[PDB]
Symmetry: C3
Subunit: 334 residues, 3 copies
Amino acid sequence: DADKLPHTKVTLVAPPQVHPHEQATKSGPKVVEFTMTIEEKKMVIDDKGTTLQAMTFNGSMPGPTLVVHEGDYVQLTLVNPATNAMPHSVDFHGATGALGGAKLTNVNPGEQATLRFKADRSGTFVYHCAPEGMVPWHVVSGMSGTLMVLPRDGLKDPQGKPLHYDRAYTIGEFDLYIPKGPDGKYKDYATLAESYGDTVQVMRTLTPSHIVFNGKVGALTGANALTAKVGETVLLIHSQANRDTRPHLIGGHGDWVWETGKFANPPQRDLETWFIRGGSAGAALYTFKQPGVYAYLNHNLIEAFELGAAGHIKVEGKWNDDLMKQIKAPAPIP
Amino acid sequence: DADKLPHTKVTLVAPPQVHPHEQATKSGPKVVEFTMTIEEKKMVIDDKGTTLQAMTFNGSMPGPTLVVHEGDYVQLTLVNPATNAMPHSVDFHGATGALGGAKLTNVNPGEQATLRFKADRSGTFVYHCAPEGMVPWHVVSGMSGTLMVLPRDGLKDPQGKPLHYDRAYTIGEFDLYIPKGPDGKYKDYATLAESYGDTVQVMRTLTPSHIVFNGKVGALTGANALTAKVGETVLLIHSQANRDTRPHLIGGHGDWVWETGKFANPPQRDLETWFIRGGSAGAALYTFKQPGVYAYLNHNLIEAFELGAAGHIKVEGKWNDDLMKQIKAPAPIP
Amino acid sequence: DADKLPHTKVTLVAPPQVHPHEQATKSGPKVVEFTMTIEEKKMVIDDKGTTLQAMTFNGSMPGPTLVVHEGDYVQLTLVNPATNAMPHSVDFHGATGALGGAKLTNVNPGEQATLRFKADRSGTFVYHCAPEGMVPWHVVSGMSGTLMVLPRDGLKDPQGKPLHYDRAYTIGEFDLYIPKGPDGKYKDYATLAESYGDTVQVMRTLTPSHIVFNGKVGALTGANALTAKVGETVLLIHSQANRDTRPHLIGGHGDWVWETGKFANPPQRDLETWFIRGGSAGAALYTFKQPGVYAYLNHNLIEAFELGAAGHIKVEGKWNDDLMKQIKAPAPIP
Ligand SMILES: [Cu+2]
Ligand SMILES: [Cu+2]
Ligand SMILES: [Cu+2]
Ligand SMILES: [Cu+2]
Ligand SMILES: [Cu+2]
Ligand SMILES: [Cu+2]
Ligand SMILES: [Zn+2]
Ligand SMILES: [Zn+2]
Ligand SMILES: [Zn+2]
Ligand SMILES: [Zn+2]
Ligand SMILES: [Zn+2]
Ligand SMILES: [Zn+2]
């Protein structure tokens, strides 16, 4: 059909939000049009002013989440402005053929391209830049995000019963490899190209200098904490385009989790910690039962607390003493 | 109900054993009372006398395993004696709210607190210390163990048929980060506080100096080997509160494994090696079919053999030639 | 039965091919005889002539894949020629008892042994050398491969429907630990024994110098690329006997994947990236829908592109515009 089908245009929004969309839908297949514009820029990634010579989709790490339904066609215009120094492309893990689209979206600065592919498989899928010979650098420098392809009748549990979320959040976790000089301080680079050789040396050690949600230590804390309320079901989409992570909600659970991120498979329930394979996006549902400030983090606690892979969720509502109660507050031992 | 329910008191036992308990039970929900007392102490962790400035629940690494049934309430008195230097708390991954209980169990030396929570989800769950600003250090220094919440009707296979174990063992695997001095020898510290800064430096490299079962290289070997017999089904509970591991039984299998450790999910069968995500506890059932000395180990063989993540299981009984037979012993090539 | 049963002899073939075999079979159980001869040799592992003092089964990394059916007995003659310097053995993860067979196959140079075991569990299973006190070194130096034990009625999907492959490939991924001298260049060793101490130092850092498919950077590229055609279903068997990996097919998927590699468990579908636990073999089915050159790689992109864990699959056939179409080729921005 394709060329026969109706088209719709979607306006993308910045992480950690996800653009408005339906879950279960009575709509038939559409060509869903998206546009993204690559921005290279220096970004401050921690609380002591370390910078990253970063590369982004639409100015953010991660790039925005694109949401369609199974059977839809994704039609992306990828724009690489002449103000950028490097060629780029996009590899959609949700797509079939031509290195995910990368061979057909090879754009030099001042060019754009339009790729169409059929989203014939449900799930959360990573997309990332994949320019020939420079793949890992472009990815670790920030160029990834999530395509979510929802089943046309919405999410299902292992018995085929309906599942839903009331709010979606998208978290991209970024293993960064910032070089240091002879003084042990992080290097600051005047240009993207100048960061390259030293960064590759760091990459090859396999030890990140920082591991951050959404582009910086503390990105999802303070004023920028995620929010929910008791009784609300959140979807937490978690992408890691290069390295394994193990998400966990402190004082919560993964009620239903697709850790490999593919919705035609039954989810697991009651998880404490789940596993996102480097090069993938997964999805967890949780319904809040207690108010308070939760942490959502990578449960390698070093990676979380020392290197930056941790955020907060501030939840409104009424405390539930049946679920948890302080029987005796801290007080002197008898 | 809660405040209406009967109470029972459980006496904890040292790993690798697990306190006596029922699997399937005709008992209704209870408030099950536990107590644990934190002990900070220096411990020798390898065969060359390296020490760790350790922190423990009840004097052991891991802390003891607490066993209840789904629908029970866990009521823990946590005691931090004035002979300890640091504040502590407990975060139960099996609990809902208040950072796992951590916000309600913040105990300075000379204090205790009593926390109650509903164990409303079946599985093996990590619990660990989580004091504000010092979480990874307290965890890697030894403060973790397992809460096992058994379904009220016992374990089930993927078709809903009953499964059981005749003996449970609990194995906590500890990634340690022991600093070295300019001479390349491990540092020995006079106090817990003095170990801190140097240990954090090591932690941030993400490379453990040692990875040990149950507190020391060779903890589960020699006189301290696990034991079983042909025909006996063992449960191996495996916790790793900070870092991924991949358990394996040499010459055996995981007959039924919940690698994410949550019993409402169907187990997998016939595993060679399974995966415990950092920040979780999993469970494997195996029924011994051959006598002999098995290894139970982390199948990154470096981590196992060089760094310490390996134990033994000595199994009694009759050799089975149908399962395995030496047809020709080693002898000269013809 | 065993001693009653018919015997068959199988001729092994070099990776990445797998010896001819049936999937579903009307044949009853057999004693299936195999022979392998250990070869120690120096091998060049990258494009700049770095060498590895390697140890192999049948002269290749990985060793050859052995294929039987559930209920068959594997009977392996393991030959260690007097031209080798070291003792060897074999541990079959598919076997039950005696440390996988290792205790019964302990062969010094100039000896051979014959081991029989029942392949009573379906799946892909690692086998590897396991000589007492030298296990990790022998494994990381190249001594591993795959035993595939097919269900007697062939592969099944989660609903019990038949699945099949038209071509099997076997990929062993090898984390290598090549030492360097004071000049920062890789060391070349005159003998296997001389490589030992320095290699163990590298191993303990847990950082591989190289991570290669099938014995060398680029082993599965150029003339040596894997091949298939549109409409053909390939099985990709992936073993990693020491360290975790995360396979991915760029521009493809895992249509059906047993990432833990055990066929009595239902596979997952539509995977972007899957996970092979160190110490295991997994299996993925994919049916090609687009022609072109695909990459099959470890999706830690550093490990793939910088360290060597990547291969190619060249696929013949007709491009499918419904699945993917370049709507606008790269061209100047309007
Ligand atoms: Cu790019
Ligand atoms: Cu990719
Ligand atoms: Cu503590
Ligand atoms: Cu935790
Ligand atoms: Cu060997
Ligand atoms: Cu093994
Ligand atoms: Zn149209
Ligand atoms: Zn809702
Ligand atoms: Zn009461
Ligand atoms: Zn029994
Ligand atoms: Zn015979
Ligand atoms: Zn076919």
